[PDB]
Design a protein around this ligand. Structure first.
Ligand SMILES: Nc1ncnc2c1ncn2[C@@H]1O[C@H](COP(=O)(O)OP(=O)(O)OP(=O)(O)O)[C@@H](O)[C@H]1O
Ligand SMILES: [Cl-]
Ligand SMILES: [Mg+2]
Length: 535
């Protein structure tokens, strides 16, 4: 536990009521207190899970992310202003940090506080011991779900080496004079080992905040830090699935035929692949119980639904994106029946899958990548969206995000590439590119087809298939696969002619080529251009 004096040491004063390590039962009763006002309020759904609204923010706010630039971070951090590529690592002064810390600590002073101690990282040797402090019960619940829950023995010996202070209810009145983006802030200090949050209530800031810290500390010790889901077969064969948001990492790793290691954040050290987290954070927009039975089944007491529409009768309309398209549910990982336990880790990955949702409808559902293509596509980090849907238009809009997670990278993309390649080479890993997005039908590839494709990757069916080369992107693709619609395997088949596919392929190829140009200032980078699409 901790005393009011211990909180005083952090700068938080006059705390009279302290809830240390709140139980799931307490969090349930706290959320449902009928006297709660505003965004703290929870409502009970017919599935038995509590639902909350996360307020004005229903996703992360990268424009409000700052890292204190000091002698510890100056020469290692991938800074937004250093001329080494676009990122969100905006530099913050130590003086401005102290002002933000004053805002948050005063906001939390004189309040009833939840204190949640948890781990980030499955392995004792590299895990962070994180202490989270909040005045909002559902925020405490989110962290209880998403981080690793210590045992009673671990709690007795708990020594934090990172503090996360959530001051969602405060804002920064001096932001203009400080040169910041807004009155909100998500700030990190690697000297004081602390994260401060102001203005946004969104729980993902804590989750991805700690991921950003692991992404800083682990590769500097030779450990890959990866934006991927992961699972393992009965024989100990491990797969990792990289991809940007909405590409299928959580959906596809939750597979009845595999033991789930984790759905979002993993390390890769000398012993194998390990989860940083204690829970999963599923997307619920248009959720289908038939299509995603395990994720659906995880929505029960102790899960926490976010921003969903709950009807008067307590039923949920999963199709309603009126609050946000980013509706979510978090749950502790043991709400999934087939998981790796008691520790979320396994051996070395031998299958590396890059998921992408191609709104341009160009990329094949599945292709086997060469070693050089693996590096090219990892640095590229492509996905796309139909941005114009609400206006009745396509407007395919590309996103290139290095390492399939540039928003969370604390070091240069090439540092993540180097250590991933080292780990893959040692393991004899093979890499694959999977389009979970669109084809010439203007519809997304079915979850059924995609799962069958993943099965074929994992069981060696794809590796043994007759393949040919798709032009332009030069991707090795199969003629047929068990349980997969044969028609979809060649992306040209869903257009009126290959020439109509090619028009779109040329557009997309040019986007890749222009994006990759920034990596060609080194000889290694320049040499990968040949592995990219070619007009
Ligand atoms: N063929 C498909 N494969 C995977 N997901 C699909 C497919 N078709 C539709 N979807 C939908 O796409 C979304 C995939 O979301 P998921 O939560 O798996 O993304 P994620 O990669 O985990 O994102 P994040 O990084 O934000 O956690 C879900 O809404 C899912 O129902
Ligand atoms: Cl992302
Ligand atoms: Mg996910």
């Amino acid at each position: 536990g901790l005393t009011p004096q211990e909180l005083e040491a952090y700068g938080i004063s006059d705390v009279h009521d302290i809830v240390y390590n709140p139980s799931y039962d307490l969090l349930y009763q706290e959320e449902l207190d009928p006297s709660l006002t505003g965004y703290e309020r929870g409502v009970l759904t017919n599935l038995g899970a509590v639902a909350v609204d996360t307020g004005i923010f229903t996703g992360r706010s990268p424009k409000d992310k700052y890292i204190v630039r000091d002698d510890t971070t100056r020469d290692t951090f991938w800074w937004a202003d250093k001329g080494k590529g676009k990122n969100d690592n905006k530099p913050l002064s130590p003086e401005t940090w102290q002002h933000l810390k004053g805002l948050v600590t005063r906001q939390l002073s004189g309040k009833r506080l939840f204190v949640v101690d948890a781990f980030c990282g499955a392995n004792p040797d590299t895990r962070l011991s994180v202490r989270f402090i909040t005045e909002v019960a559902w925020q405490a619940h989110f962290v209880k779900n998403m981080f690793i829950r210590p045992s009673d023995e671990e709690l007795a010996g708990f020594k934090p080496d990172f503090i996360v202070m959530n001051g969602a209810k405060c804002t920064n009145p001096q932001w203009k004079e400080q040169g910041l983006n807004s009155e909100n802030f998500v700030a990190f200090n690697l000297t004081e080992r602390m994260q401060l949050i102001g203005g946004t209530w969104y729980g993902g800031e804590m989750k991805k905040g700690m991921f950003s810290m692991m992404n800083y500390l682990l590769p500097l010790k030779g450990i890959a830090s990866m934006h991927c889901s992961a699972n393992v077969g009965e024989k100990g064969d491990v797969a990792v699935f990289f991809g940007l948001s909405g590409t299928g990492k959580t959906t596809l790793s939750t597979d009845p035929k595999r033991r789930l290691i984790g759905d979002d954040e993993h390390g890769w050290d000398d012993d194998g692949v390990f989860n940083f987290e204690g829970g999963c954070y599923a997307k619920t927009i248009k959720l289908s119980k038939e299509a995603e039975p395990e994720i659906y089944n995880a929505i029960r007491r102790d899960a926490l639904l976010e921003n969903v529409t709950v009807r008067e009768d307590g039923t949920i309309d999963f199709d309603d994106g009126s609050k946000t398209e980013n509706t979510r549910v978090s749950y502790p990982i043991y709400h999934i029946d087939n998981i790796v336990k008691p520790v979320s880790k396994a051996g070395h990955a031998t299958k590396v899958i890059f998921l992408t949702a191609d709104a341009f409808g160009v990329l094949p559902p599945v292709s086997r990548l060469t070693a050089d293509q693996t590096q090219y596509h990892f640095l590229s980090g492509f996905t796309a969206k139909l941005a114009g849907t609400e206006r009745g238009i396509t407007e395919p809009t590309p996103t290139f995000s290095a390492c399939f997670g540039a928003a969370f990278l604390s070091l240069h993309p090439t540092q993540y590439a180097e250590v991933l390649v080292k780990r893959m080479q040692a393991a004899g890993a093979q890499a694959y590119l999977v389009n979970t997005g669109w084809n010439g039908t203007g519809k997304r590839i079915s979850i059924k087809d995609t799962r069958a494709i993943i099965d074929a990757i994992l069981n060696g069916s794809l590796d043994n298939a007759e393949t040919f080369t798709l032009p332009m992107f030069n991707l090795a693709i199969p003629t047929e696969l068990p349980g997969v619609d044969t028609k979809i395997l060649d992306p040209r088949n869903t257009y009126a002619s290959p020439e109509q596919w090619q028009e779109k392929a040329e557009t997309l190829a040019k986007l890749f080529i222009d994006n990759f140009d920034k990596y060609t200032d080194t000889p290694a980078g320049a040499a990968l251009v040949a592995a990219g699409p070619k007009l």
